[PDB]
Subunit: 455 residues, 3 copies
């Protein structure tokens, strides 16, 4: 029989609904198709990104280690499941000993000999009180936990590839913007040099143009480096080189992601892989309490073989030399100086530790999803404000330029307007990147992209 | 007897006093009430923060795992302490075997049978040279180490909750400042629109006001997000929701912390929990050398039972069927092909590793405390300078505004002054946050807040 | 015999050459003296840095733990290598038991006794199918892996000490620059106060000078703190205090590093320590497959002693009381309910996991080296651009100042020029630091500085 305690899922120590406030929209509530069911093929619209995610799914080495781990823990479960059954082997044994007279059978010193070849089992533990089965069930729960760990690793890898691709694309946009602004500054500096060679443009205007040109050159080199390093990061995350015939990707100003629902927090318990990993770890910890308990009950062992035995090696397998052995044992502990009780306390404390860690997994998932929702409820406003700021700075630069052709202004206000426009556009690229990254992380936290197509 | 080497605490490989220089004040020297004795109820003046720290102390799941760990290592010590005593059980044994004629007692093939029920101990190791006791003492030292680990986890959690609360408060202040500055910019933009509709204000002034308004709007959205995310972070660190009836908190411009003393570096050895954890780990490593050594001396074992035995099952417990067994053993190793010596080398290298790790713990604590002191000796000057900068920028903005009502200046100098004032105030909030965080981390490094009230 | 599979190094899952693009120079190809052979005494020209690296090599505690680890894994290999040979000990045994009549030799209840002192081995496993040798070879491969781990730790420590020294030096330069700019601002503010007391300088100019002075004061305090904290970081990385009589160091504007070659990616396989660590881990995983396999073949055991035995304690060691025992065993498993097969699957999956982790080590090294090359191919351009920007801002400030002595400009353009110059110089210091750090990390990734002199 089995001494495992009944397993009861701990209550989620999180609020019943995601936090509401100035940064949060209205709670959508229960979703018909939850985020974890929305495949990454549908969440990510960019087909090049989809083919890259597929390349990573099939070539990233960390995900490969995760899948191998599932296989190893399945082996371990299988090793524990086998230990229930008697191990049956062939045993060849010989014994040849000299013995002094007071211990020999003859009364004088003697050389005795004995030989046997038997088929049987030694010290087989008859799982009467479920110790071995408890250990099997803990192995099984740790294996299910490893499976959930693989699914979590995949969601992590998907989000990592998306973020690497988006970061490379954003830095490529920054590089292009810097190229355009450097070309503008270089044209302006050459015109100002020609106007200074004729005594019209002052040295002040020329030096300010030169500062603008050098600053743009330095930022150009910086973003050139960042673009190459983002390529390297993406190649590492893919586990393979970038394919040559990739489909056409979408630019940052397109709709790149599907707006995934928030759902209820409780959905996480059933749909977020690392929470299910935590829960299977807890169910294993619980399973091991059965073993700790079974130790106090009687242990039943059996040693049994059948085969041939003889005093002479020449008499083996020979008619009239058959032998067999049946040897049962029971052991009931009485006194261990508190050992068995301390072992059971250990088992119980382990269950408690796993309870705390499952609860902490739930709280961490809640915090990550609430942070994603606070980012969803504010990046739209911040991006509208940043688009309006880019527009207003462009209007101001165009007005200063239309005033410049009629003189009036000096060659400082125009450079200031251009610098502010460049900074505003860099910040707009960065903000778009941050909004896309927050949305990807929210998809991951809700249940991620374990599915390729939507279930 | 016991072969554990004498334990001698390694010398602290740090300077005798904290580093002195331009960033450090004068060394206060030995403190009457050291930082580790100052309770977190006294260190933190904000009563809302105190109630939040209490909520975290009773609901954070990592601290719960730490406390459970102390209990598990205590179980393990108890399991090792029991192994000294003989395990006494009841043993039921049966043996029924067929044997060929040349091996049977009758000279022809025979079925013999034997049964016994005894009370006794099997293979009990008489701890003569202290092997088992060495292992017990290593278990005990690892348990004391786990206790110190819990205390370190609590200090870490206290500092983390303080820093989360201060970060939420600072970002709320940034949000309020941004609201005020956005309202000012919006009033100014509406007045400039009305002045432009009558041909008085130029399009340049209007576009610059619009850029200011959009920038403030974007920063407003950003800080709105940060405030919500800081709330989420704090809720995760509490392990529970924020309580509704919290006392009134103190604002950032108040005195939030007590200035804790620096003390001597040596104080750390006796008062910083992770150093004591390291030292108990080392004392355990040392304890295990006793076991490694005891292996070379004789091992003494005893098997002893008393009970009933009989050739027939029907003859058990029956008068004249009593039996008893006394079976001692000594084993002295002679040749192991260097095994035992390599085992002892392993034990000794482990002691050495723990020595290095205790020393590294001391050096790390010294570096953290010296960094806290370098922050204490400079944040005051930086905060004075930043207050003076905010004041000077406010004077400049007020003078530009008092000049604006009489025309003279354009609608660009005023916006520049307002932008500089806003940036200076943001930096002042950030600097106050950094000073408070550095002070909290210094309290943690010195010995933290294991005590609630001052001892 | 041995059932270990043949070991075949996995193909490098990286491109045949480092990535080429706008941020990368032309591939130098195979180097005559590869980076891993260039000693850190030659790579780092600053002799003070060399003496500091030596101090860290001999006093850093993490590197000490790494070296101790090599010694511990060597002990473990030695413990496994010994297990091949029979453990020979002296065995003292006694047995005194009462037995009921139906089981005694006399037919009535009897007390029998037996004593022996023998020299021999018990249950010695004759490594016929290489199980023990397989475990030895896995121990040996894990030891070689630990050796490579030490070398990687040293390269890491060297790069960490270089980066700590360069960061301290850069922040000291920032502190000196801030001191100079604060002195300039203070002189200018005092002159403006004297010019305002006579009604010449406006309050606007005075307030703007005061803002500049306070900003410089705050930045001064910040960099003062950073310098002290960098000192603390360096002291922690050294494991010892800074020596007093250090040689003269080189300034940031000097040539501090030797430009190390890139070489081929394949060079990493043979020259980067953590890849060789990964490979030895894989060779160990492979080695353990031999043990998993050997389990299925017959196990051969021997128990053999020679000594004295007697029915009376007084008859030991006595002429005619010699005895000896020769007891061989063979065990061939037949049925284990899939256990042995699951054990072999486990071994094989472990080999596969180590394959994936070695491949991932190769890909990570490639990405780190490609990032170092993308930094090498762009920091030169960015630093030229930043020097030109500092020069142009200095020209602009000098022209504005030469115009100021003849009045014309107000006391705002000069402060703006000074602020831009200060920011440009800070960014130039930061860029030089980043270029030096990237070059150090590239040296580490290529093979680091395991050698002191060049091999
Ligand atoms: C003589 C051998 C009998 C050994 C007892 C076997 C105990 C069987 O145990 C059963 O095995 C199944 C899979 O193995 C599982 O489905 C059951 O849950 C499990 O209880
Ligand atoms: C025919 C042998 C019966 C074995 C005793 C009970 C073992 C229970 O074990 C079950 O035995 C089944 C076959 O009997 C197998 O198909 C199952 O895999 C196994 O779980
Ligand atoms: C007649 C009494 C028979 C005793 C046989 C079983 C004794 C079990 O002992 C009990 O086992 C429990 C585990 O489930 C533990 O919780 C208890 O602490 C332990 O006392
Ligand atoms: C591993 C199984 C070992 C037990 C196999 C023995 C099967 C039954 O044992 C039989 O019992 C009879 C009388 O009791 C004898 O006459 C037979 O010789 C004997 O084989
Ligand atoms: C020449 C090398 C071969 C060595 C033979 C080893 C086998 C030893 O032979 C032994 O000798 C005994 C006599 O004392 C015989 O009675 C035994 O039957 C036999 O086991
Ligand atoms: C595997 C061990 C099985 C060996 C079979 C032993 O031998 C068998 O048992 C008796 C002894 O010879 C004989 O009576 C049988 O005829 C013989 O086949
Ligand atoms: C290494 C394992 C091989 C198995 C041994 C073959 C089985 C031996 O076979 C036996 O040999 C005896 C002669 O000694 C004969 O008396 C038996 O009839 C015969 O069955
Ligand atoms: C046959 C089993 C014997 C059980 C022996 C003692 C069981 C618990 O031990 C108790 O703990 C006390 C601690 O002071 C000891 O003094 C006593 O042995 C006993 O009262
Ligand atoms: C066979 C009896 C030998 C002497 C009995 C020693 C019993 C030791 O006493 C043990 O002390 C522990 C606390 O220290 C308790 O937890 C154990 O229950 C108790 O049995
Ligand atoms: C017959 C059982 C005797 C076993 C030897 C017991 C060894 C006792 O050992 C003692 O036990 C105490 C707590 O357990 C400790 O206070 C002592 O430091 C320890 O030496
Ligand atoms: C009464 C049994 C004596 C046991 C032999 C020495 C065991 C020493 O052990 C001690 O025994 C004490 C009771 O004697 C217990 O109170 C202690 O917990 C225990 O440490
Ligand atoms: C007459 C000689 C008696 C030998 C019995 C003990 C032999 C101990 O042997 C010694 O034990 C020490 C551990 O303390 C080790 O340091 C030594 O290397 C080992 O040789
Ligand atoms: C676990 C303890 C087992 C030993 C208990 C036996 C107690 C003493 O043993 C006694 O010795 C006497 C002569 O030597 C005999 O007359 C007694 O029958 C016998 O019980
Ligand atoms: C009908 C199902 C019950 C099976 C009974 C199993 C007990 C076997 O009974 C055995 O048989 C022997 C004869 O060879 C007896 O002499 C033994 O006393 C007995 O152990
Ligand atoms: C627990 C095992 C204890 C069983 C007690 C065995 O039986 C006891 O010993 C002898 C054999 O019967 C008799 O002389 C005693 O009267 C009897 O009580
Ligand atoms: C399962 C454990 C139960 C313990 C068995 C009860 C003890 C048996 O009791 C014994 O039974 C004998 C008859 O066979 C009698 O001769 C003995 O007098 C009686 O004490
Ligand atoms: C009874 C114990 C026997 C001890 C056997 C050898 C002890 C150490 O072994 C030594 O190492 C040498 C290595 O070349 C071997 O040649 C020799 O066996 C021996 O000199
Ligand atoms: C019983 C003797 C069997 C042959 C003796 C083999 C002894 C192996 O020699 C061993 O080699 C090691 C170095 O390799 C040494 O560290 C060991 O001390 C030495 O004993
Ligand atoms: C009687 C003792 C014999 C035990 C078998 C020893 C197996 C020897 O094994 C050999 O030992 C050497 C170092 O130990 C290695 O160089 C060899 O690779 C290894 O195969
Ligand atoms: C002289 C004892 C021979 C031991 C049997 C083969 C053991 C092989 O082992 C080798 O033995 C050599 C000495 O013989 C040692 O020098 C080597 O260290 C050892 O690897
Ligand atoms: C006459 C048949 C002799 C069987 C003795 C060895 C049986 C080995 O068995 C085989 O060992 C291999 C390991 O190398 C495994 O891959 C196989 O799965 C296993 O079946
Ligand atoms: C650990 C080694 C134990 C075996 C040592 C015994 C050496 C050889 O054994 C010899 O065999 C002869 C006949 O076979 C007898 O006359 C001798 O008395 C006996 O010593
Ligand atoms: C006075 C304290 C010393 C106790 C002596 C313990 C040794 C017990 O002495 C035993 O008694 C037997 C008689 O039954 C003798 O025949 C045995 O030779 C002897 O082992
Ligand atoms: C270590 C155990 C070795 C003890 C030696 C046993 O004693 C030896 O063997 C026989 C019995 O006395 C005698 O014939 C020998 O002369 C004697 O030296
Ligand atoms: C504790 C180990 C000490 C070893 C015991 C010394 C060896 C004993 O020596 C033996 O003593 C016998 C008397 O009993 C004599 O007959 C033997 O001649 C003598 O060799
Ligand atoms: C002497 C070794 C006995 C081998 C026993 C069975 C070996 C594999 O077991 C098989 O698996 C099936 C699962 O349904 C079981 O029904 C059967 O026992 C068997 O066909
Ligand atoms: C001695 C035979 C007792 C009954 C045989 C039970 C065999 C259990 O069957 C086992 O089931 C596993 C799948 O579940 C397979 O992987 C094993 O190969 C198979 O042997
Ligand atoms: C689940 O609750 C378990 C039920 C109780 C079973 C008790 C144990 C009986 C089996 C013992 C048979 C072993 C024979 C040994 C002969 C000396
Ligand atoms: C501490 O220094 C230990 C002191 C030395 C004690 C030596 C061992 C004596 C005990 C042996 C008794 C076992 C009897 C076995 C009978 C064959
Ligand atoms: C490598 O391929 C192994 C070769 C095959 C050797 C087979 C095993 C023979 C040794 C057995 C000797 C033990 C004697 C036991 C007596 C009953």
């Amino acid at each position: 029989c089995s001494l495992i305690p009944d397993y009861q899922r701990p209550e989620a120590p999180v609020a019943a609904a995601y936090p509401q406030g100035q940064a949060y929209g209205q709670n959508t509530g229960a979703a018909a198709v939850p985020a974890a069911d929305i495949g990454w093929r549908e969440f990510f619209r960019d087909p090049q990104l989809q083919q890259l995610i597929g390349v990573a799914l099939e070539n990233n080495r960390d995900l490969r280690v995760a899948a191998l781990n599932v296989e190893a823990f399945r082996a371990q479960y299988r090793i524990q499941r086998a230990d229930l059954f008697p191990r049956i082997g062939v045993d060849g044994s010989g014994t040849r000993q000299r013995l002094p007279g007071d211990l020999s059978t003859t009364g004088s010193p003697a050389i005795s000999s004995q030989y046997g070849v038997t088929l049987g089992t030694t010290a087989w533990e008859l799982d009467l009180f479920g110790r071995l089965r408890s250990l099997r069930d803990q192995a099984l729960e740790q294996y299910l936990a490893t499976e959930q760990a693989q699914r979590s690793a995949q969601t992590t890898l998907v989000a990592s590839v998306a973020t690497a691709y988006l970061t490379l694309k954003a830095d490529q946009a920054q590089l292009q913007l810097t190229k355009d602004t450097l070309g503008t500054y270089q044209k302006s500096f050459d015109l100002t040099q020609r106007s200074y060679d004729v005594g019209v443009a002052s040295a002040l205007d020329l030096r300010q143009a030169q500062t603008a040109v050098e600053g743009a050159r330095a930022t150009l080199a910086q973003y050139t480096r960042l673009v190459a390093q983002d390529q390297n990061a993406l190649v590492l995350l893919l586990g393979s080189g970038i394919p040559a015939n990739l489909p056409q990707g979408l630019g940052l100003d397109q709709t790149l992601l599907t707006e995934v629902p928030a759902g209820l927090p409780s959905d996480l318990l059933q749909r977020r892989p690392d929470i299910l990993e935590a829960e299977h770890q807890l169910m294993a910890a619980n399973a091991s309490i059965g073993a700790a308990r079974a130790a106090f009950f009687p242990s039943i062992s059996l040693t049994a073989n059948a085969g041939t035995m003889s005093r002479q090696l020449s008499g083996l397998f020979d008619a009239g030399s058959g032998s067999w052995l049946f040897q049962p044992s029971i052991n009931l502990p009485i006194f261990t100086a508190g050992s068995l009780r301390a072992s059971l306390d250990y088992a119980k404390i382990q269950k408690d530790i796993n309870v705390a860690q499952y609860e902490k997994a739930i709280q961490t998932a809640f915090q990550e999803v609430a942070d994603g929702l606070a980012a969803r409820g504010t990046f739209t406003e911040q991006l509208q404000a940043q688009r309006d700021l880019v527009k207003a700075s462009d209007e101001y630069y165009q007005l200063a330029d239309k005033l410049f052709r009629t003189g009036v202004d000096n060659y400082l206000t125009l450079l200031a307007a251009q610098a502010s426009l460049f900074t505003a556009q860099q910040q707009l690229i960065t903000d778009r990147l941050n909004q896309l990254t927050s949305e990807v992380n929210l998809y991951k936290a809700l249940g991620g992209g374990w599915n390729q197509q939507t279930v």
